[PDB]
Subunit: 265 residues, 2 copies
């Protein structure tokens, strides 16, 4: 009787750790969710085949309201696994599920996996220099979210980089692109006018991290806002003050304008 | 003609991803480095046996000064792997190595794996709330670095959590403990009197992330400064004001005293 939270990784079924695979392979029951993120390089079948077990997919409602009614009961007499994209506890509310397991008398274990949060390192931006992170949510009705704009502002004042997770509506299959995120930010800039996000703002786009050929691009908003970065998922990053080597990488690897080599210390 | 930056993960030889293991097995040459960090839950022999390839270990100088003389030449006419603990390119100097590869006419690909930056999610702290990260270094001679202290001050000033990497003498396999880190911080507090780190400060200690039996402890400095958190490596975190959900996890999963539910929320 035990519950394993197992991350599947960034892009395909092979992004799971060897540890996670060995353990999943020997679990009696296997559950999973695919609404917290998008694994653009695989399918449920490829995952099932790799693990050699049938996988029951749960919706956000199944988890958020019935985790203790669907999964925990089984973990009382067997070994159960709960799979998720990336790392199980990053930019999700899955950590609270460990409390539910406790209160149900079920020991739980976490098997980590590559997360978009650390894969940002491939942009060449020093990961220790990232500050508060934010999520850009699709506007709904007359409710128009803007908190992520202040996050960028606060970080930028401190010279820190900002990681912006992009919205995802799995059931509708809506995956916010870096372009849509850029458009939303420009609209918030007009509203607040704090000189935080403009056509001249340098940004970095990372698409489909985890694949062997992700899209890594850096440039000014005015030039990237209409560029095609391939299929989702995408993340947007607003760098803070750049180090010479960060800029060198952006130019050499992310194709940024050579003029950013000239940093303003 | 191809260089693969492959991550080994967090603790043992099973923390490498399936994608990384298979790709390393198809490589003609395999290098590794264990100066940026160490795999406390395994050995070079076990990693070697798992990959089924002889592994040549490179020192900090081998990499930083002669990467293009030791690794790249072979990468010109072969598939070469460069293994590193955690997720590739997280260590601040590693990204630049891709520029050297390009400059050498060598194609490079990054194969991700779990990093402590994302793994700390198991502490129950929301990942978006982490601010700038720092490293606590051992003082030596007339040198007593304290900038990591200011990092905590600025993060906590904004309700942000601070991730503190602890010093390590990889060569001498000497791990700074969470306890030593706290003593150092108290000392710095005594010298800067900024009211940033005191006996009443709440902290979180994460030891052996990646293991099935990691140590997750949360509490006040005065009660944890002499507690035994087990074998290294240790990671220290100074949380900013907590979200009730975070506090509940620290209490239920990390054994934090109920006092944080009213004092740190
Ligand atoms: N491979 C990938 N490439 C680019 N962005 C990604 C990504 N995987 C996740 N994301 C980003 O993160 C959002 C999901 S947030 C959930 C993240 C997950 N637990 C992890 O550890 O990575 C997506 O909407 C997207 O903006
Ligand atoms: Na961070």
């Amino acid at each position: 009787m035990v519950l394993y939270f197992i991350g599947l990784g960034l892009y395909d079924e092979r992004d799971i750790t060897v540890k996670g695979l060995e353990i999943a392979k020997k679990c009696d029951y296997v559950f999973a969710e695919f609404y917290t993120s998008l694994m653009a390089g695989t399918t449920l079948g490829r995952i099932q085949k790799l693990i050699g077990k049938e996988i029951r997919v749960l919706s956000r409602e199944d988890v958020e309201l019935n985790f203790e009614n669907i999964v925990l009961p089984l973990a009382k007499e067997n070994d159960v696994a709960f799979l998720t994209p990336g790392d199980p506890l990053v930019a999700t509310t899955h950590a609270e599920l460990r409390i539910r397991a406790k209160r149900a008398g079920v020991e739980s274990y976490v098997i980590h996996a590559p997360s978009i949060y650390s894969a940002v390192g491939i942009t060449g931006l020093h990961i220790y220099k990232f500050g508060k992170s934010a999520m850009v949510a699709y506007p709904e009705g007359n409710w128009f979210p803007t908190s992520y704009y202040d996050v960028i502002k606060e970080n930028a004042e401190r010279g820190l980089h900002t990681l912006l997770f992009l919205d995802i509506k799995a059931e509708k299959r809506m995956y916010m692109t870096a372009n849509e995120a850029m458009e939303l930010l420009l609209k918030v800039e007009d509203m607040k006018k704090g000189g935080v996000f403009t056509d001249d703002t340098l940004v970095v786009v990372l698409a489909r991290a985890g694949s062997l050929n992700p899209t890594i691009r850096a440039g000014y908003v005015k030039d990237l806002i209409r560029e095609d970065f391939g299929d989702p998922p995408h993340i947007l990053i607003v760098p803070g003050k750049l180090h010479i080597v960060e800029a060198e990488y952006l130019v050499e690897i992310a194709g940024a304008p050579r003029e950013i080599l000239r940093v303003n210390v």
